[PDB]
Structure 1
Amino acid sequence: ETIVLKALVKACGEASAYLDELRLAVAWNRVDIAQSELFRGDIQWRSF
């Protein structure tokens, strides 16, 4: 479920309506992904 997540960011990575990796976990309605994405994994989240 994170590898599926991993492939989409490489796909969106700079044209296709920036999928942002965390906006996606909201749309899947899966909370445990959204925490570990934001708590860990080179935490460099900007404003937008």
Structure 2
Amino acid sequence: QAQVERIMTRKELLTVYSSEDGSEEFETIVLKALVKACGYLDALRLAVAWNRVDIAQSELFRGDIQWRSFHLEASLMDALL
């Protein structure tokens, strides 16, 4: 019980892979887990690191995220390099 309590002490890192009747959508779940853990590191830079452009398309498509200049500039530099 003490170990479980210490685990929950940092529950930000832990994330549950929702069964979702076998969603088999691994990249998006990984990205969500990394974003939650982070609380610079951006989902855009990671997506650029991978070759998945659809993931970044979904990330940017949602209007919830509001982007600044340097935020996109760094990702653009990464994509160019």
TM-score range, shorter chain: 0.7 to 0.9
Find the aligned partners of 1:10 and 1:3 in 2 and give their Cα distance: 11
Cα 1:42–1:11 shift into 2, 3 Å: same
**3-state SS in 1 of match to 2:41:** coil
1-structure distance, mates of 2:57, 2:36: 20
| Percent sequence identity over aligned pairs | 98
- Equivalent of residue 27 in structure 1, options 43, 49, 62: 49
Distance change (3 Å), C-alpha of 1:3 and 1:23: same
For structure 1, the 5+ residue unaligned runs are none
Greater C-alpha radius of gyration: 2
Cα deviations by residue, 1:6-46 (Å, 9 ceiling, x for unpaired): 01112222xxxx21111110101101001111111513111
How many residues end up aligned between the 2 structures?
A: 44
Structure 2 residue runs without a partner (length 5+): 1-26, 71-81
Please report the TM-score for the alignment, with normalisation by the length of structure 2. Answer: 0.48
Partner of 2:30: 4
Which of 27, 39, 42 lines up with 2:61 in the alignment?
39
More helix by share: 2
Q: TM-score normalised to the size of structure 1?
A: 0.73
